[PDB]
């Protein structure tokens, strides 16, 4: 016996199933982002680990604290909003780190 429900599934794209998997498995890292004024900006490692655990637990939305506010992170539509707000919402996403050249170096003697 077997099923398509025995594995994970990704959001839509213009790429292929062998591209999305390769972008992830080529490093095995992860990060979360949200749309600010000038583009996508990364969450704190304190915070993004809570978002990363929520889709792994099975919940459809989780909660997080910031500079002075509680934001509800919805995993279904990939957005954030305040607990009292039903309509107005800001975009979030998952992404992967590629690692800089600073990750490669010689022996401790030089
Ligand atoms: N995902 C987030 N992580 C951390 N801080 C956030 C996040 N979303 C909002 N903030 C910050 O919390 C503060 C208030 O956010 P709020 O959503 O009220 O801003 P806003 O006035 O609606 O912004 P804008 O109209 O520019 O989108 C701002 O300093 C904002 O950058």
Curated annotation (Swiss-Prot):
E3 ubiquitin-protein ligase that specifically binds poly-ADP-ribosylated (PARsylated) proteins and mediates their ubiquitination and subsequent degradation. May regulate many important biological processes, such as cell survival and DNA damage response. Acts as an activator of the Wnt signaling pathway by mediating the ubiquitination of PARsylated AXIN1 and AXIN2, 2 key components of the beta-catenin destruction complex. Acts in cooperation with tankyrase proteins (TNKS and TNKS2), which mediate PARsylation of target proteins AXIN1, AXIN2, BLZF1, CASC3, TNKS and TNKS2. Residues 18-94 form the WWE domain. Ubiquitinated; autoubiquitinated. Autoubiquitination is enhanced upon PAR-binding. Was named Iduna after the Norse goddess of protection and eternal youth. The chain holds residues 83 to 179 of 359 of the full protein. The gene is Rnf146. This is E3 ubiquitin-protein ligase RNF146. It is found in: Cytoplasm, Cytosol; Nucleus. It comes from the Eukaryota. There is a cross-link at residues 11, 21, 57, 102 (Glycyl lysine isopeptide (Lys-Gly) (interchain with G-Cter in ubiquitin)). A glycoprotein binds at residues 34, 37, 41, 71, 80, 90, 102. Can form homooligomers. Interacts with PARsylated AXIN1, AXIN2, BLZF1, CASC3, H1-2, IPO7, LIG3, NCL, PARP1, XRCC1, XRCC5 and XRCC6. Interacts with DDB1, DHX15, IQGAP1, LRPPRC, PARP2, PRKDC, RUVBL2, TNKS1 and TNKS2. Binding often leads to interactor ubiquitination, in the presence of the appropriate E1 and E2 enzymes, and proteasomal degradation. Induction: Up-regulated in cortical neurons by treatment with N-methyl-D-aspartate (NMDA). Toxic doses of NMDA fail to induce Iduna expression. Sublethal exposure to oxygen-glucose deprivation also induces Iduna protein expression. Also induced by treatments that result in resistance to subsequent ischemic injury, such as 5 minute bilateral common carotid artery occlusion (at protein level). Expressed at relatively high levels in the brain. Also present in spleen, heart, kidney, testis and liver. In the brain, expressed in the cerebellum, hippocampus, striatum, cortex, frontal cortex and, at lowest levels, in olfactory bulb (at protein level). Predominantly expressed in neurons. The WWE domain mediates non-covalent PAR-binding.
